[PDB]
Amino acid sequence: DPAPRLAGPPVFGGPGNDAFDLAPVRSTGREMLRFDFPGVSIGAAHYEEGPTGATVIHIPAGARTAVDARGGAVGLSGGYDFNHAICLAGGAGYGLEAGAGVSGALLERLEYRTGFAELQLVSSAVIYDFSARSTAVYPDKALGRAALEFAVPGEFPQGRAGAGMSASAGKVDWDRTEITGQGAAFRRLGDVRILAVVVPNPVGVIVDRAGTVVRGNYDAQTGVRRHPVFDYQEAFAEQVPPVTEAGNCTISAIVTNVRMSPVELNQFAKQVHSSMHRGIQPFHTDMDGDTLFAVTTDEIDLPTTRLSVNATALGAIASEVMWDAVLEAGK
Amino acid sequence: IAVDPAPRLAGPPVGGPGNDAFDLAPVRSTGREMLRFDFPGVSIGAAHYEEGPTGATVIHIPAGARTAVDARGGAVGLSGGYDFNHAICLAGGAGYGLEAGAGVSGALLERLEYRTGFAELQLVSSAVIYDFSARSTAVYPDKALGRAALEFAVPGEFPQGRAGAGMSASAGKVDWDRTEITGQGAAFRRLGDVRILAVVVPNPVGVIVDRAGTVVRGNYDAQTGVRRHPVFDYQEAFAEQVPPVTEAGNCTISAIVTNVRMSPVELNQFAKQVHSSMHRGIQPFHTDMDGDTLFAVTTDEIDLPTTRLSVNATALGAIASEVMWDAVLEAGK
Ligand code: NA
Ligand code: NA
Ligand code: NA
Hints:
2 copies of one chain form a homodimer.
Chain A: E1 25-26, E2 31-34, E3 41-47, E4 52-71, E5 76-77, E6 82-89, H1 97-109, E7 122-126, H2 141-149, E8 152-153, E9 155-158, E10 168-169, E11 178-179, E12 183-189, E13 192-201, E14 205-207, E15 213-215, E16 218-219, E17 224-225, H3 228-237, E18 249-258, H4 262-275, E19 280-281, E20 289-300, H5 309-330
Parallel strand pairs in A: 6-7, 18-20
Antiparallel strand pairs in A: 1-3, 2-9, 3-4, 3-8, 4-6, 4-20, 5-7, 10-11, 12-13, 13-18, 14-15, 14-19, 16-17
Helix pairs in contact in A: 1-2, 4-5
Residues 43-44, 154-158 of chain B line the site of one sodium ion.
């Protein structure tokens, strides 16, 4: 209601990358979102051997980017203010290797030109998905390259796909952790386009607009999911240590076509990222490594007439698109 | 430090091949000279590809060590940037060279028998220099080169000069005709039980300056036989009402490692102080044309005696600032 997807407790000491001839698989997930956003392509690939994967947002023209990183365990490479691709992956910090696969592939496509203005810029972020499985396989260069090679315009594989293969929510106790997925949502308003992509691996739980906990912290003894604050407040009431496992974060992107200055884009990124504490609770905690990329293709000038009404209004809309994406990941 | 007055002009950059065009064998970098130091628990390895030429330098601290990162300028190239690290990987190849850190990470995971508990994660922070203007290939530090640098790590040794990440580092990017090859550099001091190690790979837009204020590496004008401070070029452009010129692809990546226990707040303040101090030896510094990144690392081994603001961090910062200037001068020598 929704049915549980308990991850079960991890088994450590399983086989790693060296044990397999790892075969990239194109991730299709549970269903395909289709959208109209020329110049923005998405690819997703996984290793069944994990299972673990990578999701690549490819913007071949390059696009201005703001990064908003929060919590105590961020796993980020590049974090550039201009990107040709964003690579999201499992495997904790080891999975940043997938982004090197994307960077090297883009250098090849550029016929190995290395002038400073031709540098192919990939920002990468990762989730700790080793809790959700019993292997040590992680996204490697080959998997990042595969995700890029599978990238097509206007498609996103919802659910257990790419970086979302082994994403999970609700880390108060691993016995109550549930598999999430990745999610995406898209809106067009006049000529304005907003795409949200998210891979929620939070310490917290996914919450819908009614306040219902819909994924994470499921107790098989009760058949019910609980907001973590109730666990935490009873630990403090009982004067016992609260418990929670490390290895959490949400990694996300907003892509829009609206021209924004560097200041507007950074403020927009912060607003949208804070808004995600509506659908993920708690969020931005010391136990999380939350990283949001806000990307603009700089195509549309909004009509007007030092503080940006347009960034605030766009931020409010983009916040709703992102909440929709979080709910798709949890579905 | 007897800096060689002779010029080492890089020359103008050149359609060259990339990594898989070559059968790349890592070479253990020995540089011009070995620094020997006494700091158990800290090892340095340096590897290069002749075909670049380009390389990587890895500082390996297997215990793990608390770290503060201080990043400045408009072109920083960083991976991880963790507050706790088992290794720091410094490399050429611009952002492509961040791959070398993935090689270090994967090797450390193999050494840990593929254990993946959160507390057992092997944490590598990586930073890069743009060294493509100093050569004629697209070769960059890859996983194999990072792994090789880690495998070459020797306790208590550092190869000075054109070695590891320093192989194609360069200074003075007002005009590529006046750019000179630098190198990497290290210096070490022991004071009572305090140990301070500085490592630097200067690829600055600016020039290396000695304690007398002499420009000793970068911005060498072969028409005059002397190096001058970039400010002279910039002020002449503005006085002439013509655009100043300067090439992109600059930064200095560095580490300061000490055994003195510091809180996260002290360590971050220490990092900022030491990094700012490097504007003495590198000028200009922390510019929008640079991607300057300093890692300040404590191995948390000794408590300094005491008598909300840290005198110990300030005093240690002053001494570490001198060790780092010495390291910059060894890179430029
Ligand atoms: Na797509
Ligand atoms: Na050493
Ligand atoms: Na220690």
